[PDB]
Amino acid sequence: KIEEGKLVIWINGDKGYNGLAEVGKKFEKDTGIKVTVEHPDKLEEKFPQVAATGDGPDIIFWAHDRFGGYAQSGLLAEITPAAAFQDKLYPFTWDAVRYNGKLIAYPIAVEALSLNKDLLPNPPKTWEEIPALDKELKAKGKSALMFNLQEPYFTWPLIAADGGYAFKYAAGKYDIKDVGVDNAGAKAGLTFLVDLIKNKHMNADTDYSIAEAAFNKGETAMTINGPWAWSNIDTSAVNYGVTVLPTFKGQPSKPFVGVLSAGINAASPNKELAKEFLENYLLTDEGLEAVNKDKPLGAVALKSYEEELAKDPRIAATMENAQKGEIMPNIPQMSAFWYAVRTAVINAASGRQTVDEALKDAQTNAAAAHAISERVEKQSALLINGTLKHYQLQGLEWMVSLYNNNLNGILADEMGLGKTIQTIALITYLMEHKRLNGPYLIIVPLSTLSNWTYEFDKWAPSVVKISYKGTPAMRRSLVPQLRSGKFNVLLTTYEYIIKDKHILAKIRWKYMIVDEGHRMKNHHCKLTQVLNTHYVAPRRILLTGTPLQNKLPELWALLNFLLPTIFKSCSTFEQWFNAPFAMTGERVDLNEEETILIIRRLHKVLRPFLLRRLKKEVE
Amino acid sequence: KIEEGKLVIWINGDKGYNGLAEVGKKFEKDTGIKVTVEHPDKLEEKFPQVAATGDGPDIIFWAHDRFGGYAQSGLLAEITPAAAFQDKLYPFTWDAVRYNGKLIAYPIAVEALSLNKDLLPNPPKTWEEIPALDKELKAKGKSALMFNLQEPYFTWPLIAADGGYAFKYAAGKYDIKDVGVDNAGAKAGLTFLVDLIKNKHMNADTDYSIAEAAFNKGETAMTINGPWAWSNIDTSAVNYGVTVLPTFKGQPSKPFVGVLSAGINAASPNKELAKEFLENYLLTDEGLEAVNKDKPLGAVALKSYEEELAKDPRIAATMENAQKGEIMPNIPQMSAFWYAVRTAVINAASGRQTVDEALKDAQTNAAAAHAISERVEKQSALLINGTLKHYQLQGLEWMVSLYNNNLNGILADEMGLGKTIQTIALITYLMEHKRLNGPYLIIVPLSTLSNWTYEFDKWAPSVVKISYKGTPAMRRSLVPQLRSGKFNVLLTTYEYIIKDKHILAKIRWKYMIVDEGHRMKNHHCKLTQVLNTHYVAPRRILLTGTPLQNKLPELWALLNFLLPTIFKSCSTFEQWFNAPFAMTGERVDLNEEETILIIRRLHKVLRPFLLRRLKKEVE
């Protein structure tokens, strides 16, 4: 499992592992405690699996970002250094490892992007200077700049300069709704990049197999890259150097900062052994120096050893950039943002789209509710006794996208498209692929209660269920089985949710699923608000025959179901929608026109939270 | 002024004053302290004038309602009885004398409305019984009921029964916005009253000169009236009695409860002398009994003497009604409500309007922003060197209505209608008629600054003013004159409000007046929000040439000026108006249609807060 009185560390093969191994030796020497350092193939992939298991390493070495997910999962321990130790490192590095306002790793090294010696004797202080400068090198049958364009990481620092960002860092928390891809900053920066392409200075087709393949063959004078390039510009022996990034609009170009970190497994019994090894054997000028010798670690988190490294201009440069630039977010919403801005630039620079066009889309696509994309190739293992149709599996993919992105929703497919089976599919895939085995609540009408059991018994026999129904004395018989929580699903009706509330409200239901049935019935809000009062249900799903209704009362109750907390005190849609106009004590109901545009806006709002397919487009 | 070591009490001539005088004798007997009891003509009118002066009586005797205004003005002292004394009286009576959650009088007597002995041997338990019963007395060439209809006090108890009220009593405070004249309760009650008129049982023309003139001549069997009638039904010696009010829809008919009270002048030096006389000489079974002998006081607040009075069915009846019925509100908004419901009934019952029609209007007219009506016949005394035109004086009447009803507003009359003079008129009438002499703030543009001084110097020379302007060293010279507060008005410009804020924000400005000038300029909200941040100004007035603009930005800033507090955190109109739709993290600006109806609603909202007359309709 996870061996006591010893230390097993995972660090990638690209890093100076054999150097780290030596630091482990001095530990075992002065302490006797064995230290094993391994570089497992695709270790960052293997780590979460084995961590939930209670296996794996005691110490993990990867960038502070990938640690966010591990921290969300709780696979990393809250590191406890005293104040004095925190002063030994830069405060900005401790930020990179702070999750939910708790330190979850030890910051180690720092990497960023940075800016020839002969050809370019003096470097351009402002970005604005580069056209004049290019005319000179173009007159020499060459160019002044040729970095990677086709990728967004390299092209983002000027977009970031004037005030263009990804997620607005709140209190101690990023906001995935406050996205800065459409502000003047981003537009000034991206317009300028397209300015160089249209003025023939820079080519739009410019990728990495050119970014490096030209600056190394003496074709260009300047380039924007990181430490992984330095070693290949040494091979071609071109007289090079690195420096700070230019001030576009009298503002510094902000690149993304990667902080190599050491995290301790929440499963590892040797937590004080790891704090002792890290705080006293690794996070020391001597300890860091030891690793740096096998493969350099660029800038370091440690103030003391950083000054000694700042002797080299190259390291003092990346570190200067770092404090002025910005740290990579640990939040999963990054995959959307990068995909958004990747395409934004390709288009804007190719001519296919206007700067204001590409950035308009990129900003929307990244702030999108279904940001976390997750492919579902095949059904659950627990999902047997039949193979789902193409769309039913597609239905599960949107429902797991609902789960991953922590959103509630509606499956409004036409009756007889297998919504029942589709729910069953979500519940199984949420056990066989995620560790969500917790109490599922399923509210079905009497008339289909029995069919719901029937289909579970067929397709997912593994899923054990309580079927909350019967005489008062029969319902009582079930009372213990709940307290046990040996069940995955409970099935019951609208009647028992309200009547036997004093027993069913008591459970912390992981997922709540309501099946409206066949009957096209208009629902009142008074009831949903009452369900809301007593029931803890983070993830909600609604299954309905009917599509989105064009009636405010129904839409009002739909929102109270979909967003339970938000409308706590406010009981009516009238109170809610008059509110921006209510501040004069005037009490007037909405009119016909006012109402039409409210319904209009509500349909556009609920738009990404509903899924509906029709028999006529399927078969 | 207000003589020490003595007591002067005011009670009306209609009450048992010579009986109260005797209670004063026993005080002087056992204490030596002289007690003088006077019944001044229109004493409730004379009291506020003389109380603000620091003159008048030490003790005042009137109903708990008229004491609300005296309490708002602070002409009555916070009475301090210990817990034990409060138990001697009913808790519902102590409510009647609680203003701003402070006891401000001593409850004394209780009066209400109540319900023949022979003709009607058994009284009708339910209101619903009266048609069947009327058929009997109509078969005897008479009628079963003939009370006052033309008045609203008498007709309100059934309107009140099912749930029809005037002002929703909050925490310990009435809500003049939460008015219950349009609910099902009021409609069930008022429909029933019209049911009797259309079925020829009751006549719509029925007034007091019939309500009494018929029941006393043996014409009718039942009537709804109060204690002031009892004495005249004794003269005609008709075998009568009083009882509880019927249950319409299985609910008791709620009438209005008048609580005769004893208030102590906040000016009176003899505050402990009055508490001693009241708590120990008047509010005793023996003390109350003494007054009751000159002229009866119906039900009493005192538990102990009330049981002894409950021997008479008549008193135990009014007291039963009282606890089930409701107490008269002390708030000034009553004049609107009564005028609203007075006409509502006249119409509904005459046929001129439908129940749903009259009550629709009555509910609106009573919840109206300009509820407190106050006539202004002639201008101020301090307003000389010219006589105002008809509309300019009308302008002052709407501006004092703005003041009385504690509302901000706009005077958007066409340039050259004498808005300047009209402001001057409000400022003077607010000194000569109200004691508002406090610091007035007036913001005028540079170009008219000098004309503003000029017109004051002409019309209101009495009004002394600081004219905040000049070089830094000249502005400094004024610094003391402000700290003094020997001035009524300060005149200054937009420039000095922001620049010399660190000096002008420090004053608690009673009224703030902004004169937009002539220039049709579009105003930004960023500035009004900044003015709002640092300035204390309860009453605001805006003077402008231009009428209400059809642009959301301008309307947004207008609301921040008009309602300063309300939009504290919310900076934009976009954030504010998307808010009921914002709860999904979606950030989308309003469209063309959405915007049109917002402007629409805002114009209807601001409608009662703007005054505009045009040259073309005046001359």
Ligand SMILES: Nc1cnc(Cl)cc1NC(=O)Nc1snc(C#Cc2cccc(CO)c2)c1Br
């Ligand atoms: N489909 C559709 C399209 N468009 C519109 Cl506008 C409305 C639509 N339907 C809809 O909103 N359904 C809703 S809303 N609240 C509920 C609920 C509930 C509930 C569940 C269990 C117990 C209790 C208390 O007894 C209440 C339902 Br079910």
Ligand SMILES: Nc1cnc(Cl)cc1NC(=O)Nc1snc(C#Cc2cccc(CO)c2)c1Br
């Ligand atoms: N007339 C009219 C009709 N319709 C619409 Cl939509 C808008 C209209 N005008 C209007 O709203 N005026 C407003 S709004 N806020 C202000 C203000 C102010 C202010 C005063 C002193 C100092 C500072 C800070 O320097 C600011 C004014 Br003045």
